[PDB]
Write a protein that binds this ligand. Structure first.
Ligand SMILES: C[C@H](C(=O)N1CCC[C@H](C(N)=O)C1)c1ccn[nH]1
Ligand SMILES: [Zn+2]
Length: 138
């Protein structure tokens, strides 16, 4: 679990969005595994606007942060799950690291701010849904 709180927006994994997220929907994209809902309280997270390919992510299944080198956002084939059929997930960045299903939502950050959230895992890999291109979040 986990979300990004920026301005009047909450960014979550679309497959973990709650009934309240869908009732306050701003934007969603199944191909990116992202959903953004509106909030009444002001969020104070900062979104990075950069081309970093290194950062640190939070892994809830280890209660630890890990440094990672990750690929640029791209279209990656993701196997079928209970949430989606087999498909290409866009704007996805991969790194070598630990990620179990409940780790989705963990933030990846660089020195500029929030880069994205954990969205995929298994096999000693961790995949992050990029949010740096969503300029409207600010
Ligand atoms: C194995 C699982 C996973 O990659 N998916 C299931 C949950 C939905 C994911 C998606 N983005 O399509 C894919 C996962 C998450 C985090 N660590 N391991
Ligand atoms: Zn950066």
């Amino acid at each position: 679990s986990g979300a990004i709180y920026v301005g009047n927006y909450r960014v979550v994994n679309r497959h973990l969005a709650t009934h309240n997220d869908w009732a306050n929907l701003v934007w969603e994209d199944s191909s990116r595994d992202l959903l953004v809902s509106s909030t009444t309280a002001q969020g104070c997270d900062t979104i990075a606007r950069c081309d970093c390919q290194t950062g640190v992510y939070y892994c809830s299944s280890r209660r630890k942060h890990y440094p990672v080198s990750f690929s640029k956002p791209s279209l990656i084939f993701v196997e079928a799950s209970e949430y989606y059929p087999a498909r290409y997930q866009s704007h996805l960045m991969l790194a070598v690291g630990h990620s179990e299903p409940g780790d989705c939502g963990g933030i990846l950050r660089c020195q500029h701010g929030v880069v994205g959230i954990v969205s995929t895992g298994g096999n000693g890999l961790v995949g992050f849904a990029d949010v740096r291109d969503l300029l409207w979040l600010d």
